[PDB]
Every structure is written in structure tokens, then in C-alpha cells.
Amino acid sequence: VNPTVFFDIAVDGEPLGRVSFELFADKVPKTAENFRALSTGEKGFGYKGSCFHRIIPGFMCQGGDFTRHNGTGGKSIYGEKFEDENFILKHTGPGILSMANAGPNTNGSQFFICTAKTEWLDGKHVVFGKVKEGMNIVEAMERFGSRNGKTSKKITIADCGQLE
């Protein structure tokens, strides 16, 4: 019953591969629905064509700023930034999908994929999904990042949507 969504990743415009996600709608329905709807584009805006603007190897890949492309933008499907739904799920290792934010109850569209256990984020960022297939593609993405997060190649979501 939990939705599955996919991202088709490109690097400087060349296809890299697909990464799918299980979205934990049974535990965090409002947060999972936000990400699902942005991935299908069914509200008229969303992730398709956006970039991963901050990649720090051994740490995480951050994306979802489809409005300013640099970490300062993005917006939810709810017309404003929304609340931290709960912190039931923890940052337990690589593949965890979590919401970026600018402090309590400031969720928009930005998210990150963990590439290591990041337990210091527990209780600060809402975990809402996990990579299902294509962890190897996130590992290939990670190699284009750097210590300060700048990417050495443009990493874009060439296509995205809902699976099954």
C-alpha cells in the first residue's frame, strides 16, 4: 500500500540510472504525500528537471529545490511550509530519505538521501522513505560531490513519477 516513486538521474545531461523509493505513508502520510505529489507533478509543479545541489560524500545527497536550484527555495503542495509530522522513523543508515528544513515545522520540498548512518539528525528531520532499488546509482551520484557540497557535474532529475 505504501507508494513507490522513481527518479531518473542524469549527469551533465547524460543518463545515469533510476532510483526508486518506498514512501512510508503508513507512518508519515502528510510527508509521504507531499513527496509523492511533487514526484508525479500532478499539482503543476514538482521535482522533474530539478537538481541535487548539495552532495557531501559519506554523508548525504540533497535535492528538491525546484524553484531556486541552490537550497534557498522549494515549496510544498500545501501552499506553505508544513509541520514536522512525527519523528517515529530514525536515520539508521544509507538510503534513508528525510526532509530538509530550516528549523522546526519548516518542511517544503527539499529532501536528502543518506549515504551513511546520521543519528545526530534524529528528532530534527522527518524520515519518510527509503531507497528501494538503485542505491548503486546514489553511490555513483555521491562521487560527484565534494567536501563543501559543491557538485563537479550537474546532477539532475531527468524524469520522475509513481511506480506500480
Side-chain angles (χ1 to χ4, degrees), residues 2-163:
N2 271 347
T4 293
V5 291
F6 72 93
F7 289 2
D8 277 340
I9 304 298
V11 173
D12 266 11
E14 288 301 314
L16 179 64
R18 182 169 279 196
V19 55
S20 56
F21 310 92
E22 173 182 2
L23 310 182
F24 303 137
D26 53 341
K27 313 202 176 193
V28 277
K30 185 174 186 180
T31 311
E33 175 59 18
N34 182 63
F35 185 94
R36 189 203 62 79
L38 295 173
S39 291
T40 66
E42 60 196 65
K43 311 283 191 215
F45 53 85
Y47 294 130
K48 184 169 181 182
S50 70
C51 70
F52 279 87
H53 59 270
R54 191 174 183 244
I55 299 182
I56 304 172
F59 183 18
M60 53 90 125
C61 297
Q62 181 167 327
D65 181 350
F66 60 86
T67 73
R68 300 184 57 76
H69 331 293
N70 66 2
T72 62
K75 63 165 184 178
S76 78
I77 63 168
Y78 303 112
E80 56 181 341
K81 299 293 181 261
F82 65 102
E83 70 267 28
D84 299 315
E85 192 156 17
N86 60 63
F87 298 105
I88 282 312
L89 301 161
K90 315 304 185 195
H91 291 84
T92 61
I96 284 284
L97 183 63
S98 178
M99 289 301 292
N101 59 62
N105 305 308
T106 58
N107 294 281
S109 58
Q110 293 190 50
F111 61 89
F112 57 100
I113 297 172
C114 299
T115 63
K117 174 178 162 184
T118 55
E119 72 272 20
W120 59 92
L121 301 181
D122 288 345
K124 292 181 186 181
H125 301 273
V126 174
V127 171
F128 67 94
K130 165 125 193 13
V131 170
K132 203 208 11 127
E133 293 157 29
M135 195 58 203
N136 55 293
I137 298 300
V138 175
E139 297 176 331
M141 274 180 48
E142 198 181 15
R143 292 199 208 98
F144 289 110
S146 69
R147 188 177 179 185
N148 69 22
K150 174 191 187 186
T151 64
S152 53
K153 295 198 186 299
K154 197 77 174 179
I155 311 304
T156 59
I157 299 166
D159 196 16
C160 46
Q162 189 159 2
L163 281 183

